[model samples]
Target chain A: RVNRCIFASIVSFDACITYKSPCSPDAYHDDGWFICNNHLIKRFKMSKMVLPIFDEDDNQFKMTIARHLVGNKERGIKRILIPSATNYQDVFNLNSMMQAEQLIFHLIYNNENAVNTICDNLKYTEGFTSNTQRVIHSVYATTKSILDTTNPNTFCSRVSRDELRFFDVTNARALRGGAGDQLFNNYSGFLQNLIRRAVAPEYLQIDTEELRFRNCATCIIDETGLVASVPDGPELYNPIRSSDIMRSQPNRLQIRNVLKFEGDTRELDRTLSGYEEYPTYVPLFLGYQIINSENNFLRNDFIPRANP
Target chain B: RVNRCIFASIVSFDACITYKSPCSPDAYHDDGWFICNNHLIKRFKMSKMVLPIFDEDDNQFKMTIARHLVGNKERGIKRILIPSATNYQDVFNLNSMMQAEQLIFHLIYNNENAVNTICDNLKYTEGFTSNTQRVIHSVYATTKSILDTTNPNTFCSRVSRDELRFFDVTNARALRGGAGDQLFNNYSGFLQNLIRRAVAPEYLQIDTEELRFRNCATCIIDETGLVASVPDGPELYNPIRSSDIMRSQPNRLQIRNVLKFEGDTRELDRTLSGYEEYPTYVPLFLGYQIINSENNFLRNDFIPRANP
Candidate 1:
């Protein structure tokens, strides 16, 4: 079965910065043109843009974004968005697409530590995603967006003109540039490294090979559900895919001898076969929602208090 | 409060080989005096012996032995006795006290693997002891018995006369000898090494310092509840007992900073204080029980089967 698609969006009271398509021109509009996707009129349906929405609570904001991405049916919300900026000076301002793109990247990178802290504080909260899961989703979503060349408004194209130059998206790989260029080559690698460093004293305990295999996808899906195959990178290596499912008699005997204490070798055989048969393509999408909150929003009032 | 005393015993239908005292001379007797504590009549009550009891079922046998040791209230049974011998000839002949002592040591040394296998097979059974806990208890019990010098029939004294010669028993130390002489100094160390080797691929995950502190006691209690101080060995080292409980301001501040993520350093403080205040003397006792089984008993009919 195909893996579930990873998606992300940034939304505020006045504006929602996310991906939009030319096919859905009249889908989202506001009281005035200033709050709509007017600037992205000629862009592809999957192109990133700043759109307008009716102001709503955090729950409704999440529901609206889910509706745009996965259809009109209400679904379970993973996490509600918190203010990306902690101080007034760092607030979005939301004047232009450049500012909106900046806000998007800021939400992806800067909020990680705070989000992790909040997750740690509310660990017992039901249906909440772990910091690791959040990091993996964010990395997958960002990587897929950068590699998507179907639209001129790709995350890389949008950020290329910025002064910081966070990515080198010329070769469709979107290699990390500027500050992150020294550590990792791609956005996924950078984010993985970020989380690895953050959870240092307590290791993630996941195999690096498995993580590498998962991150280096050969194909991805756009918002329109079209498969787009990409050039394979050196990191697109999976040992389990190439391993011999059936071993020689002697090897099998040795494995059987070792596994006698732990019972049954057939389960292992089944798992290996499953991995080998897994599909290469994975789907990822991005969208946004405008939640009703002040421009200088900081704390999460939705977080349940232990005492109260 | 003192820790509960660890105890061990070995009993067969024909013979009951265990520790006894001079005070309990007429406590055990059989038909025509063929199976009684006549040989150990002059020995200390805490000394090892080969006494006698009426042959009965495993449950009744265990209860009878418990009554002799802890009185007739009929306490909860930890584990039922199983035949130490697997082959027909290796079974206890019950010819003399020498053979009985051999069975005692044999039960201690040889039955570890079988008992562990049995324990692993019955892991899901409620109130069953884990292999680690069993190892710890066995180690403590054996060490205490060997170090005990209040009786002329201690575990060390009983084994010193054998051709295999498992212990030194000189100067109240009972250093290991014979085949196991090369690896460890005493029975406890030998058993610990045995377990450590057996569990090679999987680590015990216990601190070496903690294990050492627990093993090397400065004092031990006899079966009669009298305390006997032992000559302090090099291994009687406890860092936690001697460490400065009240830290300097800088050290406390640093610890508090690290512990902020884990919340409430007072619990840690309480645990450390508990260790420091723990007593040196830990009571250990040894006894035996005979069950109604054949000479070459092997399988455990008591083990609950998945199919059943």
Candidate 2:
């Protein structure tokens, strides 16, 4: 089964900025391995077989962005660390059906075969015998340590192939395409329902008669951008889109600050009922329901008589 | 602490890429809690909590997405299916040092605590736990969720602190900086010594010189573009420079492909050393060693570069 825990962090978040400040664009910290799916090299690169020796005080207990250097040189910085793959009876015990489902997912997603061949030899190396083998997987045993082909011909071909490979199913599903629109609708509802359930009107205020999710984006600019008078509050409905966010392409995005507003409310009367049980959808409906009234709170935009 | 694997197809050397086609501009398919450490919300929305409603096919999944409706969508459809913290030990095992390390990273880097609260509570009456206990996370437990604040004040405070929050001495050790350079040099040499010992390139037509690791920005293109040609292949004498990256940014990196070119013989030589013996500095060098020397034959650079 794919029974492994891996942590990943964004090693570099420089938005086109590179210099002495961030990581220099050179080998000042250069190594040879480029975490590819190449196992042979991966094992070797991460293995103590070739790593620089350390003098203690360089390792970490919890594996944060800290404790990564080997010799004087840093060893692992890009990939996430996994502590132990063994010793699971206590931890992996199927205490509940929830865990069982997760196990099923693991067995399916990370089948041993998909991620095996990492360190077959170490399985037999000294100290790593049957007794100790199960208990160990040196730091070197993990983390990608290899790159693919190194010659120019296949390199060129692979480069071209990489271009073609870039077009994958995952990336394809990014934009509002055949299925994108539907996904959005469902996702949005999830948001609206939650705020409704979590926040009581006494505490949360929905600026009725407005865009969905508070339109915090517009609210931020001018006063918060564009608006002549910015409302005193509201975190970001979302962060601003980066300069080159490929508007045409389908990729992940941010909603900026969708929550948080200047607060200090006069608690509301617990009178409203049949409001579908959640208030987060207030911006969704574009209006607020009257207290305890079986009145439709949707904006006039929804009613034909309002348009005239 | 991290674990890695490499795959070379017995048939065509393609698996993940085969399931879907590629797209343009790097959008589409980007789905699930957008890559914010791991537990942030998606641009569209989080999953909807449904109770006892069963859709036989992938419809349940589709319906979830169909409802969220992200803006300005496109193709390259990649959606992520993330399970929750309720089953802490499921996807995350705190069993061993490796597993614990990995888990710690996934949790902190991604900030998953939010998903439990942000996810839609499909079970209105009961919540996450049994109706008896009222654990709301039970519904949509496996669905990708976001981190929502329990209180408006907390939300406001959190929104105010949306800056990245990652810190680690180990990470600091391997990254670029005065703090990391000397160590990088030491580890670089340590890994290279091992590689040098293993790389006997006395009989070579094209000198298979030094093999080290560095970022792509400097390694590939500089100010120009995909280096149409190299003056004399990649440098082999001096230590890799700090600003050698050809591109101002990564992604646009150029690598030395040796499996297909004149470096084939040298790659074969390295492969003879075994996976563990390869150098840490150049996982790339070793990967080529295997790919270019599949049967220990120094011929072409096809599937042989990685797996014959």
Candidate 3:
């Protein structure tokens, strides 16, 4: 987990323009410029001014514009005119981008153990005929797609900046509101779930309607990602059998002749008289019942409010 | 990972009286009395009232009073008179004790992977002559000692209740205010650090004065526990050599004639005159300098405050 810095070249104003800042390539090249208090000072100096990129471990590196571009393709590489003099919005933007990119980098490259475990499990269960390389490629590709901003289906694409104002990108456990309400033990668990959801959706059947209702990408991704990374094989739902339930019964009965019933015979005359009277009474009863039911039962009613 | 409940026996009011409540064993056994809103109700019913003990996974089970007693001998077993009718203070106390005991239990029993890793590392580094069983035993025993309330040196013995009121026992990462201010990636890392400190404090040399000054057990324990559980072997600090520094030097110096120095020799007459004048001047200078220095420099001075 090393910290790295992103540098911008005078030829290309890519890094500068990312934060909506305008720059003249010729002016910067003619004399090295440093931004102090939002004012550009023209002075030739070593490339000391930079945008720092830290890894999960918080160890601080210098990287060219090309390297930064390769690592962070979703959002263009961010650069600060002056490292010390940046507005809260820019700082927030920089942090958000860095966290998102770093999380992707860590999950894709640093998580070798999880990758190996998942692949091994897949191979073991699917048999020796399974292509390990193909599985590996799919895992990486799927993870990238899910984290990709250009991909419309991804969490990054669906989520709004306003919603992520207080979100800690590095720590998945800091997620709250929708899917964030569900607990993710660590980043590893979060990543595993995210990847699993994309690669093996069949294992974790999340309701699409619920996802739409919640309208939170993190929650949706997390809901799908909740399956264990290491495949535990198919869990057949063994429905309880009558014989199995019977087998668990007590060895002996507490009472003898338990099944006893009494019969009544005086109701025959009343039943015959009622049957004969029913034909005439039915028409009148049906008319009254229908009128009363429509008047009383069919109207919309308000639900009562509950108080603690 | 299983949730368990600790049941109190009629013969032993140990669990019932643990929270400082007086109880008669005979009264409970004779009438199966249940405590309802702090009031006793003599109703013979199934033992539905219980003290729940959840594992890290939060699964539920039922156990005899003996099991709960064995698992939590440090504070004795805690029982609620009425689960729904308990006050905030009792609930707080119950949670605190449970967390402490649960933490101990998980670290001791559930942490097989960590235990194995440490033992393996020790065995590998120390060679086949080292007894694995002995190392395992020592790890367990030392961990218990560090967590034991009876032991004067343990964290539980030294820490105040108020400090741990908000501390989450199951999640080591929730530790805050002192050592908790330091980031622990997970419970595994926290536990590893704790055990390593006790079994092998030599690896992590924390300052005794700092530990004393902080006066925090979690901080102190966490401080000692910072060493990697899996021994990376003795790390010999390779000091930078002059040769190594020279080897990393540029192939050639940027300037060819860099060693240019200017010579000044106009002070020959002044030196002779000054030598002759020094004998008389020294006495007057020394007396004035000493007096002035004492008055100006030796007196206490206030440091100026810094403003942003």
Best by lDDT: 1
DockQ of all candidates, in order?
A: 0.02, 0.03, 0.01
Task: Write one digit per residue (lDDT tens) for candidate 2, span A172-230.
Answer: 22311223222212221212121121111111111221111111111111111011111
| lDDT (Cα, tens digit) per residue for candidate 1, span B165-237 | 1111221122233332332222332232221111111001111110000111222222212112223211211
True-structure Cα RMSD, model 3: 39.0
TM-score: model 1 vs. ground truth: 0.19
- Candidate 1: stretches off by over 4 Å: A1-308, B1-308
Per-model TM-score on C-alpha atoms: 0.19, 0.14, 0.15
DockQ of 3: 0.01
Docking class of 3: incorrect
Q: What's the CA RMSD for each of the models?
A: 26.5, 36.1, 39.0
Q: Best candidate per DockQ, number? A: 2
- State how far residue A53 of model 3 sits from its true place (Å): 39
Could you tell me which 10 consecutive residues in candidate 1 chain B have the lowest summed lDDT? B59-68
Q: What interface RMSD do all candidates show, one decimal each?
A: 27.6, 26.9, 42.0
C-alpha lDDT score of every prediction, in listed order: 0.22, 0.20, 0.21
Error of 1 at B108 (Å): 13
